[PDB]
């Protein structure tokens, strides 16, 4: 009947739907009982492809027919839970794949970023994000396609998701800025338990959150005041299931990644934006540090050298590589931002990422 | 038997009514029930032409024919939802502004604020800084120099002098709701305003909303129920500001054709809180902002925008590659300076006839 594939969303009542064509609470939707769930062994991010009876108030979903990588009988899934989540600095992902414009070695020789990890970008609003994010997706997409990449949009103006769809060739999944915060959390939700599934298939997948403190302004506007609402406009309550979300990003020893870089806003005139980037500090072991100043100078990609690095560097880069890159990441902290961002650009511009090493130790 | 003719308004409920007002609900609307909307393809902002029975027994005479609906057939209903169409960036066509010489509002708004086809405006003004001065030139502009655009002008809580004066001095449509209604019925104005607007661009056409204070709408909002998301916003509900953002996020244009321009208007330092919080909340959403400020009115000089705030987000694809740099060279000249003496200089060099003639002059 109604073949069309969507991911599965189980809501914490006895509902579950699937979200048809993904990833928001559409108008024709159809519903799965518990008694189906049960019965087929369903996760919260599972990709049906079951059939309804044409004539809950939705359809009756009769006679499902596959789950996302198996079938029905395809009930010996790991759980993300219960499962173990080694350091993640052990595959690279490599994000070099021209020289004409860098705006990707840069922040390859300053966060090396690897499968798994769980990395965070600080950035004022025009500061050069955007083409940031698309560089990075059409990067992971070339150098490496077995990720499965996919882009969340959680709070964007519908003018910028068609942008995104058309520059990034991985999966994009976003709310509109009209759409009211319950479909926020609930579309990120869905895609992180999407990626969760995934990982417990056994693919490396890469979550490309956008601006993570819309995502907790939408957690915070959803439900009213609660513990602590005194911290500068935002209760502490509101900040923990963005940290859940931003808590996915592991490894896994038996196979598999899930790494997130989430966007995070700052210096955008809101107390409440400052507030939630600073108790997601010490969460983020790799971070990325955009300075607005920077940008004006029409520099880009205009990162922060000093405070952007990455942690768990040794198990990333070789060790001749790590000394290199030790070398010259004690250069520029020698050196001051606005300074160093210069020199790093004018070394990178005769070089190919690995003749700049050469000239390095030289 | 009677023939009304109005736009219809399907509720959330089984009920669905034509204002033959227009817009606001009138003591004899025509009950139309969902029956009709199914087998018709009917949807809420359509224009219905059809018969009504005479008085015969329900407080409404439910409706009997259809004639027409949004001026083409029943059977013609099988135009596609603005919903499921692609929404490019839309700044591709861009609305002329500057009619004549005379008249320098529309000359220092396409310098500075560049608009097109489909963008989401925000007119940031104080009160007494000349916003319905600069809303009739906008409409006038449009009307004359863009015709084939349907220009709408959405007023939500003015003095029963102003609908008038509005209506009088613009020629295109003009739906307001005076502020001796309550606010349910301001909101059923923008509502079904805006879903008219959308049931014109799904034909192809292009629409352009002129919307009055985006504020007293989000009041509206706040006022019509009560609290339940995060109050603790500054005097105003977190759930009310949701609303305001449908609407003002409607403006998208088509790639299939069409447009939806909404060039709303924000009220700040009005001396309350709810206006601030709401204005705040509606950062980062508009690609198009012009900031009037009230000390440079007070100097008794207009327009009074305050020019380094205010710009267009995307103008690359609205101006041609030489006028988009001599545009930039301007802004950039125009940022030197601070905002009183950018708008006196600005002035001062726009009385050269044309806005082309000083682009020229600014070459040289
Ligand atoms: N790699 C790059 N090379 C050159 N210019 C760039 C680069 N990346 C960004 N820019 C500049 O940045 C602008 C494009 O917008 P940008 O990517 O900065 O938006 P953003 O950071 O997403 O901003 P916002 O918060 O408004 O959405 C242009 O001025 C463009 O020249
Ligand atoms: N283009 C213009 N040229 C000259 N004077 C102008 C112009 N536009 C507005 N004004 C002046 O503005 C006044 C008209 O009212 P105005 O447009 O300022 O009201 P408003 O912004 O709607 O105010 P309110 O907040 O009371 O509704 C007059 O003093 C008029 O001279
Ligand atoms: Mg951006
Ligand atoms: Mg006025």
Redesign the interface.
């Known amino acids: 009947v109604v073949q069309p594939v969507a991911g599965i969303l189980d809501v914490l009542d006895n509902y579950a739907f699937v979200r048809t064509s993904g990833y928001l609470p559409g108008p024709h939707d159809v519903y799965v009982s518990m008694n189906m769930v049960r019965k087929n062994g369903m996760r919260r991010g599972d990709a049906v492809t079951g059939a309804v009876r044409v004539p809950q108030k939705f359809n009756p979903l009769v006679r499902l027919d596959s789950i996302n990588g198996g079938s029905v009988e395809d009930a010996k899934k790991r759980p993300e839970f219960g499962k173990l989540t080694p350091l993640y600095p052990n595959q690279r992902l490599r994000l070099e794949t021209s020289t004409e414009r860098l705006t990707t070695r840069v922040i390859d020789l300053i966060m090396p970023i690897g499968k798994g990890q769980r990395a965070l970008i600080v950035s004022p ?1 025009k500061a050069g994000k955007t083409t940031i994010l698309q560089d990075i997706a059409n990067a992971i997409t070339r150098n490496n396609p077995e990720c499965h990449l996919m882009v969340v949009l959680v709070d964007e ?7 995104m769809q058309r520059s990034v060739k991985g999966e994009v999944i976003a709310s ?3 759409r ?2 319950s479909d926020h959390t609930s579309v990120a939700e869905l895609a992180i338990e999407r990626a969760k599934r995934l990982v417990e298939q056994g693919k490396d997948v890469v979550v490309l959150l956008d601006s993570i403190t819309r995502l907790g302004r939408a957690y ?6 609660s513990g602590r ?1 005194l911290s500068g ?1 935002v209760d502490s309550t509101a900040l923990y299931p963005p940290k859940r979300f931003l808590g996915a990003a592991r490894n896994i020893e038996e196979g598999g990644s899930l790494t997130i870089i989430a966007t995070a806003m700052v210096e955008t ?2 107390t409440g934006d400052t507030v939630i980037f600073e108790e997601f500090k010490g969460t983020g072991n790799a971070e990325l540090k955009l300075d607005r100043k920077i940008a004006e100078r029409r520099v880009f990609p205009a990162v922060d050298v000093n405070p952007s690095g990455t942690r768990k560097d040794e198990l990333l880069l070789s060790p001749d590589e790590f000394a290199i890159v030790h070398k010259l990441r004690r250069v520029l902290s020698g050196l001051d931002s606005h300074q160093a961002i210069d020199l790093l650009m004018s070394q990178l511009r005769k070089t190919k990422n690995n003749y700049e090493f050469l000239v390095q130790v030289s």
């Open positions: 609003p103006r519908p003018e910028e998701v068609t942008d509109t800025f009209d009211p915060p915070n506007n959803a439900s009213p005041a609402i406009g005139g809101s």
